[PDB]
Design an enzyme around this catalytic site. Structure first.
Site, short mmCIF file in Angstrom:
data_model
loop_
_atom_site.label_atom_id
_atom_site.label_comp_id
_atom_site.label_asym_id
_atom_site.label_seq_id
_atom_site.Cartn_x
_atom_site.Cartn_y
_atom_site.Cartn_z
N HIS A 20 30.75 -3.04 -10.26
CA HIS A 20 30.22 -2.59 -11.55
C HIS A 20 30.87 -3.33 -12.71
O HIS A 20 30.40 -3.21 -13.85
CB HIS A 20 30.26 -1.07 -11.69
CG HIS A 20 31.56 -0.50 -12.14
ND1 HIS A 20 32.47 0.10 -11.31
CD2 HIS A 20 32.04 -0.35 -13.39
CE1 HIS A 20 33.47 0.58 -12.03
NE2 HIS A 20 33.22 0.32 -13.30
N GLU A 42 49.95 -11.21 -16.76
CA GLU A 42 49.90 -10.51 -18.02
C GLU A 42 50.78 -9.26 -18.02
O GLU A 42 50.82 -8.50 -17.06
CB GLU A 42 48.47 -10.05 -18.33
CG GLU A 42 47.52 -11.18 -18.74
CD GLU A 42 47.70 -11.62 -20.17
OE1 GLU A 42 48.77 -11.34 -20.74
OE2 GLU A 42 46.78 -12.26 -20.71
N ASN A 44 51.54 -7.72 -21.98
CA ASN A 44 50.79 -7.47 -23.20
C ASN A 44 49.59 -8.41 -23.24
O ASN A 44 49.76 -9.63 -23.32
CB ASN A 44 51.69 -7.66 -24.43
CG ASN A 44 51.04 -7.17 -25.68
OD1 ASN A 44 49.88 -7.42 -25.93
ND2 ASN A 44 51.80 -6.44 -26.49
N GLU A 48 51.78 -16.12 -18.27
CA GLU A 48 50.36 -16.07 -18.01
C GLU A 48 49.84 -17.33 -17.34
O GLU A 48 50.32 -18.45 -17.56
CB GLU A 48 49.58 -15.92 -19.30
CG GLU A 48 49.88 -14.64 -20.09
CD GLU A 48 50.98 -14.76 -21.13
OE1 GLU A 48 51.78 -15.73 -21.13
OE2 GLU A 48 51.05 -13.81 -21.94
N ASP A 105 31.11 -0.44 -4.12
CA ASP A 105 31.52 -0.95 -5.43
C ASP A 105 32.69 -1.91 -5.28
O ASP A 105 33.86 -1.58 -5.52
CB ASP A 105 31.85 0.21 -6.37
CG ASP A 105 32.04 -0.22 -7.82
OD1 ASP A 105 31.66 -1.35 -8.16
OD2 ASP A 105 32.55 0.62 -8.60
N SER A 159 43.09 7.51 -13.58
CA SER A 159 42.61 6.28 -14.18
C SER A 159 41.46 6.61 -15.15
O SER A 159 40.94 7.73 -15.17
CB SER A 159 42.24 5.26 -13.09
OG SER A 159 41.29 5.80 -12.21
N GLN A 188 38.53 4.65 -18.43
CA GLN A 188 37.72 3.50 -18.82
C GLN A 188 38.60 2.31 -19.11
O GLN A 188 39.60 2.42 -19.81
CB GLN A 188 36.90 3.85 -20.07
CG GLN A 188 35.90 4.96 -19.88
CD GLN A 188 36.41 6.28 -20.42
OE1 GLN A 188 37.08 6.34 -21.46
NE2 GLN A 188 36.10 7.36 -19.72
N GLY A 189 38.22 1.15 -18.57
CA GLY A 189 39.00 -0.06 -18.72
C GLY A 189 39.95 -0.32 -17.57
O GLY A 189 40.47 -1.44 -17.46
N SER A 201 38.78 0.16 -14.43
CA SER A 201 37.85 -0.17 -13.38
C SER A 201 38.14 -1.53 -12.80
O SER A 201 38.43 -2.49 -13.52
CB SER A 201 36.42 -0.16 -13.90
OG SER A 201 35.99 1.15 -14.12
N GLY A 202 38.00 -1.62 -11.48
CA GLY A 202 38.23 -2.84 -10.75
C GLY A 202 39.66 -3.06 -10.33
O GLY A 202 39.92 -3.94 -9.49
N1 MRZ Z 1 38.13 9.18 -13.96
C1 MRZ Z 1 38.22 7.98 -13.42
N2 MRZ Z 1 39.14 7.80 -12.50
N3 MRZ Z 1 37.38 7.00 -13.77
C2 MRZ Z 1 36.21 7.16 -14.64
C3 MRZ Z 1 36.26 6.13 -15.74
C4 MRZ Z 1 36.30 4.74 -15.17
C5 MRZ Z 1 37.43 4.60 -14.19
C6 MRZ Z 1 37.36 5.67 -13.15
CA CA Z 2 50.03 -11.82 -22.56
#
Ligand code: MRZ
Ligand code: CA
Length: 223
Positions: free
Chosen positions: A40, A52, A54, A62, A84, A172, A174-175, A177-178
């Site tokens: 996704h 990385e 900061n 880096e 996914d 975890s 948003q941001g 992910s992955g």
């Molecule tokens: N709540 C979690 N763990 N999420 C939902 C938001 C994106 C990452 C995975």
């Molecule tokens: Ca950096």
């Protein structure tokens, strides 16, 4: 990451940031030329950023390397988030050292109760928004499949597991992910989905990497 701690610079040496003018997803370095992330997170024009801490300051460790090829899993379903997972090939090999290192693929699936490390540059709030510039970390256990299915009726496939805390407060977000879920020194999960962040009875849901090792190895051998 909500409810985590500052990892420390380069203490998670396999963590990568995917950048398309800005950080948008995490990933994990699995050898000198390949990264694994969430399907996704796919888009064109990815630069992989290794070493990385900061993400807004050049600190000196880096490596910035363009992607040459992305491969989304053949059976990824964007509606259900089943399968996914994606692979990204780097245009040139990274230079591996103590601060930029690969993470091993699992030889067996991890059991519920195993403690894992989740990391990323995602939102740190469950209400509102605050994005950190430095890498955040969270220790969390894998939850039983029965708990996971009871939290998300009708939504958990054999390619997913839950990890975190049913009481909320740590997850975890948003941001993230992955990014990686590492347990006993092996990559066992990819940050995939959840309902909100850090809500009671709504743990994070992760792609179950041990189901994909054959596909990963075959794909890397042929591309
Ligand atoms: N709540 C979690 N763990 N999420 C939902 C938001 C994106 C990452 C995975
Ligand atoms: Ca950096």
């Amino acid at each position: 990451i909500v409810g985590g701690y500052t990892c420390g610079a380069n203490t998670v040496p396999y963590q990568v940031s995917l950048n398309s003018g800005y950080h948008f997803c995490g990933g994990s370095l699995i050898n000198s030329q390949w990264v694994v992330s969430a399907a996704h997170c796919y888009k064109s024009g990815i630069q992989v950023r290794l070493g990385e801490d900061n993400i807004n300051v050049v600190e000196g460790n880096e490596q910035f390397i363009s992607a040459s090829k992305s491969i989304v899993h053949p059976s990824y379903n964007s509606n259900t988030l089943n399968n996914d997972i994606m692979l990204i090939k780097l245009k040139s090999a990274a230079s591996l050292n103590s601060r930029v290192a690969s993470i091993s693929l699992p030889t067996s699936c991890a059991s519920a109760g195993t403690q894992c490390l989740i990391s990323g540059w995602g939102n740190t709030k469950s209400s509102g928004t605050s994005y950190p510039d430095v890498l955040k970390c969270l220790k969390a256990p894998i939850l039983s499949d029965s708990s996971c299915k009871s939290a998300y009726p009708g939504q958990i496939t054999s390619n997913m597991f839950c990890a975190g805390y049913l009481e909320g407060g740590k997850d975890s977000c948003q941001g993230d992910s992955g990014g990686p879920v590492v347990c006993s020194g092996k990559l066992q999960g990819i940050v995939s989905w959840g309902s909100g962040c850090a809500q009671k009875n709504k743990p994070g849901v992760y792609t179950k990497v041990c189901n994909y090792v054959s596909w990963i190895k075959q794909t890397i051998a042929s591309n």
